[PDB]
Amino acid sequence: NKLHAFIWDSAVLEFEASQKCDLVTTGELFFRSGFGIGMRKDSPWKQNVSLSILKSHENGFMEDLDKTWVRYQECDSLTFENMAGVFML
Amino acid sequence: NVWNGMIGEVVYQRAVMAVGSLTINEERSEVVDFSVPFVETGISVMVSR
Amino acid sequence: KPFKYQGLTILVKKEIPRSTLDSFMQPFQSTLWLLVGLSVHVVAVMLYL
Amino acid sequence: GSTERNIRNNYPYMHQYMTRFNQRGVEDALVSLKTGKLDAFIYDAAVLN
């Protein structure tokens, strides 16, 4: 509770909210974009790298990576402490 | 081994660009030259509630 | 070509609705307790009268 | 289309069974799914949304 709100990428904040129960996102994504493999303008690797990325999207390899590294939830989500008062009474 | 449609028109130099609901995949990007994707798409399943 | 499509969003604290021992005393303030006593005792005795 | 190509590349057996339920277009598929003639429609995310 030192910073009220943090503006950041959807993937990172979604993963953190999945990992950390006390932190939650809000949704309503804005400025949609895509992570890319940055590299120099005059590089022969460009066409082959783009083809490999598209092929990886074509099969389930990217889905497998999402399952293994990103898509796993620890805590997502009356309680006893809500009615503890009447027991105290 | 012949492309027909929007990709067909682009390949045989009958149209410089093909604006429309054109999905980007490996074979098309190998055959033609795509631009930056401006809208998110992908396979999805739609069923009755 | 992008390998992961995502946008910008906001992260905030969960702010648990965690309750205290008086989770059922909110509707009426403390004074009303005295008042509710003043609504019963002085009645009962006069009923006896 | 692209969806059929992706289905062929990923799950050829699923495509073999699915060929018998092809639709002429999107509106025909929608009206068929509204009735009991179809159960699930596989197509790109943007148009379906």
Side-chain angles (χ1 to χ4, degrees), chain A residues 5-6 8-10 13 22-27 30 33-35 50 57 62 81-82 85-86, chain C residues 1-15 18-25:
Chain A
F6 179 37
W8 200 233
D9 307 65
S10 162
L13 302 175
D22 50 352
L23 304 164
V24 67
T25 177
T26 180
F30 63 97
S33 50
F35 291 138
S50 176
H57 280 284
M62 305 286 323
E81 291 83 2
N82 195 359
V86 299
Chain C
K1 292 298 184 292
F3 67 93
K4 175 89 188 152
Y5 293 76
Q6 55 90 39
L8 272 296
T9 185
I10 307 100
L11 181 64
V12 294
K13 194 165 190 181
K14 177 66 161 304
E15 190 63 27
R18 188 263 193 278
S19 61
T20 61
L21 73 164
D22 58 351
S23 69
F24 53 100
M25 294 296 172

Side-chain angles (χ1 to χ4, degrees), chain D residues 28-40:
Chain D
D28 203 8
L30 290 173
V31 305
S32 181
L33 179 62
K34 288 290 285 294
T35 79
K37 286 180 271 324
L38 211 64
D39 295 339

